[PDB]
Specification:
2 copies of one chain form a homodimer. A 4-stranded antiparallel β-sheet of chain A has the order 3-2-5-4. Chain A has one domain (1-130). In chain A, a hairpin with a 2-residue loop joins β4 (96-103) and β5 (106-115). Chain A has 5 helices and 6 strands, in the order βαααββαββαβ. By secondary structure, chain A is α+β, with helices and mostly antiparallel strands. The relative contact order of chain A is 0.22. Helices cover 45% and strands 29% of the residues of chain A. The longest helix of chain A has 26 residues, at 6-31. Chain A is elongated and about 60 Å long. At the A-B interface, β1, α1, α3 and β6 of A face β1, α1, α3 and β6 of B. β1 (2-5) of chain A pairs antiparallel with β6 of chain B, so a sheet runs across the interface. Chains A, B: This is Two component histidine kinase, GGDEF domain protein/EAL domain protein. Chains A, B: Keywords: Kinase, Membrane, Transferase, Transmembrane, Transmembrane helix. Chains A, B: The chain crosses the membrane at residues 104-122. Chains A, B: GO terms for molecular function: cyclic-guanylate-specific phosphodiesterase activity; kinase activity.
Chain lengths: 131, 131
């Protein structure tokens, strides 16, 4: 039988969650351009909600140049039946990734996507085997 | 030391690659709407290239109602230093996911995203431990 060490599986999720937040922010940066320029909040909300409803993100933030937050989706990590000792073994901090929302060559806004590491803890706990 | 079985790690990637292709297709479906309506091929190409340059996809296809392919990005799985016996152990077929490109309530096109399972084989091979 073949296995993967917990340490290597953890390194995958650390890297995957970080790059997924960046890739998501970059694609939202292109997707939101026209709606941000024309101040179409409902269209911007649909694009963000489609991404945030995936469930992997702790926060998604859209703001114009000044820092004026236009859209803000947030969720907390919630209660867990995972033992705290195992949570302390695998946990790692969340990282926020950004991408500029452009209007041609001019800056128009920023979209920020933050990962939710606690989204993966339960799957690592249920699939863990000790040897 | 904690481990994950190869079978459980494989089930994760089977599920993750399939849902990632679907989530990507759905977000592209919203992102490409205005450009498809106004027939802005360069803007559509930038949105697709940002997603396809990620490297996880075997193909991304944008077409109007009729099946007229507007954008087509493809890549083959390439040569591997992975032994064929291990490739046969973990391999699984690619799946194509679709999302409609809408213009309000009217249909305008379809975007199709296909996964590339062979993208993950090398990482599973380099991280594999037998017990």
């Amino acid at each position: 039988t073949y296995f993967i060490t917990m340490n290597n599986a953890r390194n995958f999720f650390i890297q995957q969650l970080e790059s997924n937040a960046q890739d998501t922010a970059t694609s939202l940066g292109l997707s939101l351009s026209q709606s941000l320029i024309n101040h179409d909040v409902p269209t911007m909300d649909s694009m963000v909600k489609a991404v945030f409803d995936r469930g992997y993100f702790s926060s998604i933030k859209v703001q114009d140049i000044k820092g004026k937050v236009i859209i803000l989706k947030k969720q907390l990590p919630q209660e867990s039946d995972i033992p705290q000792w195992f949570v302390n073994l695998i946990k790692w901090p969340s990282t926020e990734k950004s991408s500029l929302i452009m209007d041609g060559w001019m800056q128009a806004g920023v979209v920020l996507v933050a990962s939710d590491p606690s989204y993966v803890y339960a799957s690592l706990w249920r699939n863990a085997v000790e040897m």
